[PDB]
A = this chain, B = another copy of it.
């Protein structure tokens, strides 16, 4: 059979080169990097190269930290609860601003902080489907410890004005965190232009393995650890290093930035080919804005057939996509134009054989 994977915002395929670079640390180089003997120090060069790739991947400075976590969910929980202890309980700055579009890893923890008594405002989305930076200004008070706005939305793909928000946050002296998981390998990511204090990411969204993530912490910014133990990662996150996934995520970051032109020029062009081909069908319509979007995502809406039935039909035809009432289709570098023509055909055939209402 020949299956079609169009659900790359849910997770991606590991690049074969990433798997290859991970194998030796799953095989004979099994030493704990904290060990003083040769099995330990033997792993250090590859770790340094992976970390270097990550730094260079997000234009982090050598003075900055890029701490290895187990996923973006860990990074988000760590920023929000850490800044809860440092600035809300200890500095009395009991206010956090975020958006309604953030991943549940951010919003649900924010709900928990509300249950403890922190006041959090979830900014409402506007009609163009994005946020404006002035919205955060209107919501930022002199008691705001942190603003957290995702770089790109996972359901629709829209890119948010992180740069301008970073300038506002910089002028007013409030910590800035951005969940950028959906941005890596899709668009250029620069922590300096964003003036970000915190940045989240997760490997399996740019063709690394599930179960490893990263939190960029800018130099000097404090954040009480979520994993206490104080041994690893400059004492900020304890636990024996996931050596294979660290190297793999480094190579995956490298490949992701090396493929940016291909992502925008080829993957984005196929997304436009696909989208335009699908909009040649009755009362369908893209949900959201079509200009300020990441190159890989289209979010299509159909008449009165709910999206989940169409997704059942496609999976029956071995074509994988996700929801977002609407259908989210998210591409990658490993899709081909033949795959897109076939998906246009199967989508139409499924659509007319679903239209038969009653």
Seen from chain A, the residues whose Cβ lies within 8 Å of a Cβ on chain B are: 3, 5, 7, 10-14, 19, 22, 26-27, 30-32, 34-39, 70-74, 77, 103-105, 108-109, 111-112, 202, 204, 209-212, 224, 226-231, 238-245, 308, 311, 314-315, 318, 320-322
Contact = CB atoms under 8 A, between A and B. Distances in A.
A74 B311 contact: no
Given A73-B229, A105-B227, A105-B228, 18 more contacts: A5-B39, A7-B37, A11-B31, A11-B35, A13-B30, A26-B209, A31-B320, A36-B311, A70-B74, A71-B240, A73-B239, A74-B239, A105-B238, A112-B228, A202-B240, A209-B242, A211-B212, A226-B226
Given A14-B26, A37-B315, A210-B241, A70 B73 contact: no
Contact of A211 (B77, B228, B242): B242
Contacts of A318: 38
A105 B229 contact: yes
A105 B14 CA distance: 32
Contact of A35 (B10, B22, B27, B212): B10
19 contacts: A3-B38, A3-B39, A7-B37, A7-B39, A14-B30, A22-B26, A36-B311, A36-B315, A37-B314, A37-B321, A70-B70, A70-B239, A104-B238, A108-B228, A112-B224, A210-B242, A211-B241, A211-B244, A211-B245
Kindly list the 4 A-B residue pairs having the minimum CB-CB distance in the complex, ordered from nearest.
Answer: A211-B242, A70-B70, A73-B239, A109-B228
B35 A7 contact: yes
A102 to B, nearest CB: 11
A239 B227 CA distance: 16
Contacts of A111: 228
Nearest to A12: B30
B211 A70 contact: yes
Contacts of A72: 239
